Amino acid sequence: WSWESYLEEQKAITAPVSLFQDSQAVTHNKNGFKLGMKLEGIDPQHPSMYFILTVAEVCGYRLRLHFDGYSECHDFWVNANSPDIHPAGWFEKTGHKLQPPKGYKEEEFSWSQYLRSTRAQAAPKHLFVSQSHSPPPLGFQVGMKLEAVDRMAPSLVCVASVTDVVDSRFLVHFDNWDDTYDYWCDPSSPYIHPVGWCQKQGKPLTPPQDYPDPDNFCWEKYLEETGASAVPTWAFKVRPPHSFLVNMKLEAVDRRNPALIRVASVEDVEDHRIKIHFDGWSHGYDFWIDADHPDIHPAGWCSKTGHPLQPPLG
């Protein structure tokens, strides 16, 4: 199957590489991860927690990770340039806590001995883009508060806090709710706003869960209560809207079987998101995704990185 031939057949155009972040487009980096290598990483389902992970599979510039001690049901895929994985020992030098493998207890744990007991090797350092020598995001520190769109839930704007900061990104947490609605973010995110934004825009604001007398939540009072500072207004640098147009073609990871990457088209657009349609498949599989999501790539990405590309269902 050839993109070139497909474009001719369909009288179509690809989404230019310039529309993607360099990290979504870069194809010349070699994937140095190997089967069995161990490392540290956040749990995609509990973004605030770190676990010991093992490379369970390698394909092109991607890898499937497995939670040591847990079932294969928790396995997930990331790209080799993911900033959500770190080298062994990272948690200790950056002050984070590490969840022990399902059989230990993070008191009595150490890489040297765990690696010995598993006869494995830790992925070398030089493969990680996020090792935290990297400078932090400007203006965002753990403890600061802000207003954020509840992307994982009904999407109202809520009272939130920064609970973690890694490389140039930070973790957005919804005050007194579960971490299951948290998400990693950066200063250019269109989903975050300075304290007081809802009021100025004339929008309702969801206060912390069970906060006393919800209807009269007052930011100044809450900040005095918690002694926390608001993320300063100058720190918010929202990115410009993307320039993807409907019908442009690209490549995207299949959300049902993360192991596959298929030929795709832009079905619809918003200022910061695009709706992906898998050519040849039902429109019922179409889905909205942010323009900077690590799992969408320009045409040619699979071929150049050595990963199989699924052509239109035919």
Same fold, 1-29+242-314 and 30-133: yes
Q: What is d(CA 276, CA 259) in angstroms, rounded to the nearest whole number?
A: 17
Q: How many residues does the chain have?
A: 314
Cα(94)–Cα(92) distance, rounded to whole angstroms? 6
DSSP assignment of the chain: --HHHHHHHHT--BPPGGGS-HHHH---S-----TT-EEEEEETTEEEEEEEEEEEEEETTEEEEEETTS-GGG-EEEETT-SSEE-TTHHHHHT--EEPPTT--TTS--HHHHHHHTT--BPPGGG-S-SS-SPPPTT--TT-EEEEE-TTTT--EEEEEEEEEETTEEEEEETTS-GGG-EEE-TT-TTEE-TTHHHHHT---BPSTT-SSGGG--HHHHHHHHTPPBPPGGG--PPPPP---TT-EEEEE-SSSTT-EEEEEEEEE-SSEEEEEETTS-GGG-EEEETT-TTEE-TTHHHHHT---BPPP-
Residue spans per domain, the chain: 1-29+242-314, 30-133, 134-241
Instruction: Give the separation between CA 111 and CA 181, rounded to whole angstroms.
Output: 30
Question: Which of 93, 162, 175 is closest to 130 using CA atoms?
Answer: 93
Name residue, tokens 């019908």.
247
The tokens describing 64, both together, are 């499937």
Angle of CA points 30, 32, 36, to nearest 5° = 150
* 169-174 sheet: strands from edge to edge: 183-185, 169-174, 157-166, 145-149, 192-193
Cα–Cα distance for residue pair 127/129, rounded to 1 Å: 7
Tokens at 48, concatenated: 């605030």
Phi, psi of 65 (to 5 degrees): -105, 145
Which of 173, 168, 194, 175 shows the shortest CA–CA distance to 183? 173
Residue type, 15: A
CA 6 – CA 303 distance, rounded (Å): 15
Using DSSP bridges, classify how beta strands 46-59 and 98-99 pair: parallel, antiparallel or unpaired: parallel
How many other CB atoms are there within 10 angstroms of residue 125's CB atom? 13
Nearest to 238 by CA among 202, 193, 270, 196: 193
> Scanning the structure block, which residue is given the tokens 């009288």?
11
Q: Which CATH number fits domain 30-133: 2.40.420.20, 2.30.30.140, 1.10.3720.10, 3.40.50.300?
A: 2.30.30.140
Backbone angles phi, psi at 59, to 5 degrees: -150, 115
Q: Closest Cα to residue 53, out of 45, 42, 62?
A: 42
Given the candidates 3.30.365.10, 2.30.30.140, 1.10.3720.10, 2.40.70.10, the CATH classification of the domain at 1-29+242-314 is 2.30.30.140
The token pair that represents 222 in the structure block: 């809450």
**Cα(64)–Cα(70) distance, integer angstroms:** 14
Contact between residue 62 and residue 307 where contact means Cβ atoms under 8 Å apart: yes
Specify the experimental method.
X-ray
CA-to-CA distance for 35 and 30, rounded, in angstroms?
Answer: 15
Degrees, nearest 5: CA angle 92-96-102: 90
Q: CB atoms < 10 A from the CB of 68, how many?
A: 18
Domain over 134-241 is classified CATH 2.30.30.140: yes
Token couple for 281: 């498949």
The amino acid occupying position 91 is: F
